[PDB]
Amino acid sequence: EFKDVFIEKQKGEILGVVIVESGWGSILPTVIIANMMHGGPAEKSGKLNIGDQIMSINGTSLVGLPLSTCQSIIKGLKNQSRVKLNIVRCPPVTTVLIRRPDLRYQLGFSVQNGIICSLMRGGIAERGGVRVGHRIIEINGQSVVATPHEKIVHILSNAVGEIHMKTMPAAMYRLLTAQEQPVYI
Numbered sequence: 001e002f003k004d005v006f007i008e009k010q011k012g013e014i015l016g017v018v019i020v021e022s023g024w025g026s027i028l029p030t031v032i033i034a035n036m037m038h039g040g041p042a043e044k045s046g047k048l049n050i051g052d053q054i055m056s057i058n059g060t061s062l063v064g065l066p067l068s069t070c071q072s073i074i075k076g077l078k079n080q081s082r083v084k085l086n087i088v089r090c091p092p093v094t095t096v097l098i099r100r101p102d103l104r105y106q107l108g109f110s111v112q113n114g115i116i117c118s119l120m121r122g123g124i125a126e127r128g129g130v131r132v133g134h135r136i137i138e139i140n141g142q143s144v145v146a147t148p149h150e151k152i153v154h155i156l157s158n159a160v161g162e163i164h165m166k167t168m169p170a171a172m173y174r175l176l177t178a179q180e181q182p183v184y185i
Contacts, residue, residue: 001090002055005048007083009041014078015048016040018182021067022053028088030055030063031070034172035182041083046145051169054087074185091168096129096136098156098163107163111136111152114145115170125156128163133173139165 007015016037022030030053042048054070055063058077062070077083098107108123109116109130119125119132130136136152137145140163144152156163 001088003047003087003089005045005054005083005085005087007041007045007047007085008081009044009083010081011079013041015074015083015185016042017048017074018184019054019067019070019074020182024053028053028055028063030088031067033087035184036171037184038171048085048087049089049091049168050171051091052087052089054085056086058084071183071185075183078185093137094129094131094134094167096125096163096165096167098124098128098130098159098165100124100156100160100163103158103160105160107156111144111156112149113147113152116167129165129167131167133170134167135170136165136167139163 016039017033018035019031020034022032033048033050033052036042036048036050055061057074060073062073100107107125108120109125110118114135116130116132116134116136119130135145137143139152139155142155
């Protein structure tokens, strides 16, 4: 879904995101957010997330031009105070329903601030929706996307009953190859 992304930041803080050629169905030939610094103005704001395609940046329509050109477009506005980007947010949100009969019951997973790493095969956390690679966000109405790992674990540790949360897509997993970080605009 189309959505204007206003990232208010300082000069020399580009934005902190990685874009690639939209190889999807090609609904709108633009660049896809294949990666993100996860700390800079992009993550700080929360508007820019992985799995979204930027159509235009501050008037510069990326729709039509290749990736190399698109990257240069954003890279150009590195020393600005505001980053305007009309992008289409397409982040797959999974509903994690983790039922807990008692407080001494283990959900079966590990949460690290905003991303999931560990997961028990055939557990409650896995049964609900949680998946290794996702990005937990709205847990029972509480946004933990920018919350410490200890805090998130606490809620679930004392959330007996039926833990209902949402999970977005985290950074792209590159199996093993590709040690160097991609172009960050």
